[PDB]
């Protein structure tokens, strides 16, 4: 049992807690941790060199970047940003969140998530995402109410953890069913221009 | 193959029961969220 401490961090309403309750095994035995008001949910990923255990924490309130104490960041092994597409202001504070953890972390591989494009009316769109130099910073589009590339964030962080290229998760957890749907063609659009973005940066 | 115990758990080291972070030895109480180790 090789496991990480992942650290889920981005503003409020972004669908942090969504997102990680997706796991279903991770919330049935999720943890609670009352000195630092934060639950702590063992997700397992089943790859092709065995199991990977994932122990995200989620925070219990709406406290603002350098609002979380310092227990939330010990001994974090990497972390997930995220944000709502639908909110500017939410992907404006994603370098507020990336200082902190770099300030407090040092080099961790960090993903960053755009979160509810089910949603039609998309403000951030790829075109507008500031891609970046570094390699421990990788961007993927999610959508926590329906499943979508869920597994993308923590497949990455296995790669680069383990530091092995060819990394696979041989199935899928056991998720909760989809809240709603991810419009195919609308995916197939974004995975698109998310593609010609990248090759940009 | 496996991973090989790349992650091996040292021989001191323990893994707190509240919040799953590993520590030290020398570490009495956690050093995340100030549990006794046992
Ligand atoms: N359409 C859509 N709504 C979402 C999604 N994820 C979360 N929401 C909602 O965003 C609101 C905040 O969710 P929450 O998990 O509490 O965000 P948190 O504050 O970061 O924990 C809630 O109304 C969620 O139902 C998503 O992926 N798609
Ligand atoms: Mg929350
Ligand atoms: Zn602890």
Same mark, same amino acid.
């Given at each position: 049992? !090789? ?47 065995? +199991? ?5 924490? $989620? ?13 939330? &960041? ?25 200082? $902190?953890?770099?300030? !407090?972390?040092?080099?961790? +591989? ?28 990788? &961007? %993927? ?6 499943? %979508? ?22 199935? =899928? ?19 698109? $221009? ?8 | 193959?496996?991973?090989?115990? =790349? ?32």
């Amino acid at each position: 049992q !090789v496991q990480f401490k992942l650290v889920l961090v981005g503003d409020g309403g972004t669908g942090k807690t969504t997102f990680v309750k997706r796991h279903l095994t991770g919330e049935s035995e999720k943890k609670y941790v009352a000195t630092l008001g934060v639950e702590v949910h063992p997700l397992v990923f089943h790859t092709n060199r065995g +199991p990977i255990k994932f122990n995200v924490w $989620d925070t219990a309130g709406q406290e603002k970047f350098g609002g979380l104490r310092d227990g939330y &960041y010990i001994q974090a092994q990497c972390a997930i940003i995220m944000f709502d597409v639908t909110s500017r202001v939410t992907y404006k504070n994603v370098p507020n969140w990336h200082r $902190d953890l770099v300030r !407090v972390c040092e080099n961790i +591989p960090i993903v960053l998530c755009g979160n509810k494009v089910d949603i039609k009316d998309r403000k951030v769109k790829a075109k507008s995402i500031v891609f970046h130099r570094k390699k421990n910073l990788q &961007y %993927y589009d999610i959508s926590a109410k329906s499943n %979508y590339n869920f597994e993308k964030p923590f497949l990455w962080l296995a790669r680069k953890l383990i530091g092995d290229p060819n990394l696979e998760f041989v199935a =899928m957890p056991a998720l909760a069913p989809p809240e709603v749907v991810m419009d195919p063609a609308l995916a197939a659009q974004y995975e698109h $221009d998310l593609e010609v973005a990248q090759t940009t940066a | 193959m496996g991973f090989e115990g =790349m992650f091996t758990k040292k021989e001191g080291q323990w893994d707190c029961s509240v919040c799953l972070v590993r520590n030290e030895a020398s570490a009495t109480k956690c050093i995340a969220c100030q549990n006794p180790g046992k």
